[PDB]
Design a binder for this molecule. Structure first.
Ligand code: HEM
Ligand SMILES: *P(=O)(O)OCC(C)(C)[C@@H](O)C(=O)NCCC(=O)NCCSC(=O)c1c[nH]cn1
Lengths: 417, 75
């Protein structure tokens, strides 16, 4: 279903993204009102909506006239702030942000993540071969859910036995699997993550290991150690940040490939590089639909004045379908070059796990093209509900295995045993 | 208003240290006093360790006040 009017669409409601195809809505905003004022809804204030790639890029870059210290997603921005402001990386600006990012780059740089990449490739291969042997599986639960969380947990130093518990909590923090989730259940889930990590951080400061929590606990910003509170809040943003979005991208690729069998064949038959295909998967899926800022000073854009205190939302989903930047934007094209998508954001807050997210998708696509000849959707897919995230929580598939490649994989493991 | 037993008195003292303020009402709601997640985390984990009680987070949310928590603890 396609809406022609702009005023009817309420972007704060998660139901909006289920019942409607907003492709026409975003096009209309992009061409006729690039800076649109979304009206107040209930107790929530109004907010600016930015839809053009160029404007989205320009506002991500400006950390001087815009700030993240009042929140960076709708739920925090419309509440008037984020409790973790100035402590959690994503909601910190200025010197504290630069220092805190610099200590995290010791762990999340391409240079530091290389040994981890090997583990991602091994785990992903193993899971894909399992699913291919069975034939009939649920790609979300049996493959996708078992990679991103496990990766970030290994880095953080989360005990294996607590990981299933953490996945349940993540699935309630910013998005629900059920239609009408109250703010209570989400609050409980978010704080349960905080309660878990305050126990684990206390354990790691008392007895340090070599994981990221230990690296943070022994790091310094501005000549002073990080408080346990600051470490816990960042752990929250890593466990949830390194989980949902990657997971959704991986699920979306499998669904998209069934819709675009010509592009699956290009990947299967080695007619496109994994690097090129990973970028189109990321442009297509855009699992984080929006991020946001708040104006600290007055600014003019397209003749309209954005006042100090105004909530400004940047829509990555709209930016990745801009005709001015992407030729045939609603075409899924693995050969797309250049592919300067804004899925990982831009500027000072550019995704800290961009390399890690890319490595996870890359490993999946490599495993799918090697040990699979094709796949098909068998049941009704299940959409997550959110004004922030987009994707599926469940995807029933039948996988046709590449039997020769699986036999070679088994023979290889036989002599390595 | 003053705390009416050892449990209420001990709990109010925890509220004060967590919220960084004196004059904490024993009957007032935690969230109406500007209480957030960071403070809630420290609060619950401190109540658990000092009262040797496995207080669920849901129980804290349903009765986020000194008086209510004291009733739930004493049982
Ligand atoms: C493909 C999946 C991913 C997507 C779509 C994505 C998206 C984004 C975006 C758009 C931002 C910018 C936020 C802003 O400007 O306010 C961001 C930042 C961030 N991301 Fe991701 N991300 C992904 C994977 C990951 C992974 C694997 C991690 C684990 C390390 C992670 C952790 C973070 C953190 C900690 C920030 C805050 C950076 C800062 O404030 O400087 N993300 N992400
Ligand atoms: P309480 O007072 O309710 O506060 C909880 C908490 C301290 C966690 C607070 O910061 C909050 O409410 N945050 C909102 C949830 C949130 O913003 N999570 C991070 C979004 S996922 C994300 O940014 C990302 C980036 N890359 C991948 N994923």
């Amino acid at each position: 279903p396609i809406p022609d009017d702009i005023s009817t669409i309420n972007l704060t409601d998660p139901r909006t993204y289920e019942v409607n195809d907003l492709s026409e809505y975003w096009r209309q905003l992009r061409t006729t009102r690039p800076l649109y004022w979304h009206p107040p809804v209930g107790d929530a204030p109004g907010f600016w909506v930015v839809s053009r790639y160029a404007d989205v890029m320009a506002l991500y870059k400006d950390n001087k006239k815009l700030t993240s210290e009042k929140g960076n997603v709708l739920v925090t921005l419309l509440a008037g702030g984020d409790s973790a402001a100035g402590k959690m990386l994503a909601v910190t600006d200025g010197a504290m942000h630069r220092g805190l990012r610099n200590v995290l780059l010791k762990s999340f740089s391409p240079q530091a993540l290389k040994p981890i990449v090997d583990q991602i490739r091994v785990n992903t291969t193993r899971l894909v071969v399992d699913a291919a042997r069975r034939g009939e599986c649920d790609f979300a639960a049996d493959v996708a859910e078992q990679i991103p969380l496990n990766t970030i947990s290994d880095l953080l130093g989360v005990p294996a036995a607590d990981r299933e518990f953490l996945l349940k909590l993540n699935k309630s923090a910013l998005s629900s699997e059920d239609a009408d989730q109250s703010a209570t259940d989400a609050w409980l889930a978010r704080n349960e993550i905080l309660l878990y990590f305050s126990e684990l951080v206390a354990e790691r400061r008392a007895k340090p290991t070599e994981d990221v929590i230990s690296v943070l606990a022994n790091s310094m910003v501005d000549g002073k150690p990080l408080t346990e509170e600051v470490i816990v809040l960042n752990c929250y943003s890593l466990i949830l940040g390194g989980d949902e979005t990657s997971r959704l991208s991986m699920i979306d690729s499998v669904q998209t490939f069934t819709q675009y069998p010509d592009q699956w064949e290009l990947l299967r038959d080695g007619k496109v590089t994994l690097e090129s295909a990973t970028e189109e998967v990321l442009r297509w899926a855009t699992p984080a639909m929006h991020f946001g800022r708040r104006a600290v000073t007055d600014m003019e854009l397209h003749g309209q004045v954005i006042a100090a205190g105004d909530v400004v939302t940047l829509w990555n989903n709209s930016a990745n379908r801009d005709e001015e930047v992407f030729a045939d934007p609603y075409a899924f094209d693995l050969n797309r070059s250049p592919n300067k998508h804004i899925t990982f954001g831009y500027g000072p807050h550019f995704c800290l796990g961009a390399y890690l997210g890319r490595a996870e998708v890359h490993a999946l696509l490599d495993a799918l093209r090697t040990y699979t000849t094709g796949f098909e959707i068998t049941g009704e897919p299940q959409r997550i509900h959110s004004n922030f995230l987009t994707g599926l929580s469940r995807l029933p598939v039948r996988i046709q295995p590449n039997e020769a490649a699986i036999a070679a994989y088994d023979s290889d493991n036989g002599v390595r045993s | 208003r003053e705390p009416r037993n050892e449990t209420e008195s001990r709990l109010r003292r925890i509220f004060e240290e967590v919220l960084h303020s004196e004059d904490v009402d024993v009957e007032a709601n935690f969230f109406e006093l500007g209480g957030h997640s960071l403070q809630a985390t420290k609060l619950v984990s401190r109540i658990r360790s000092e009262f040797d009680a496995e207080l669920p987070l849901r129980d804290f949310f349903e009765h986020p006040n000194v008086a209510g928590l004291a009733v739930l603890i004493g049982g």
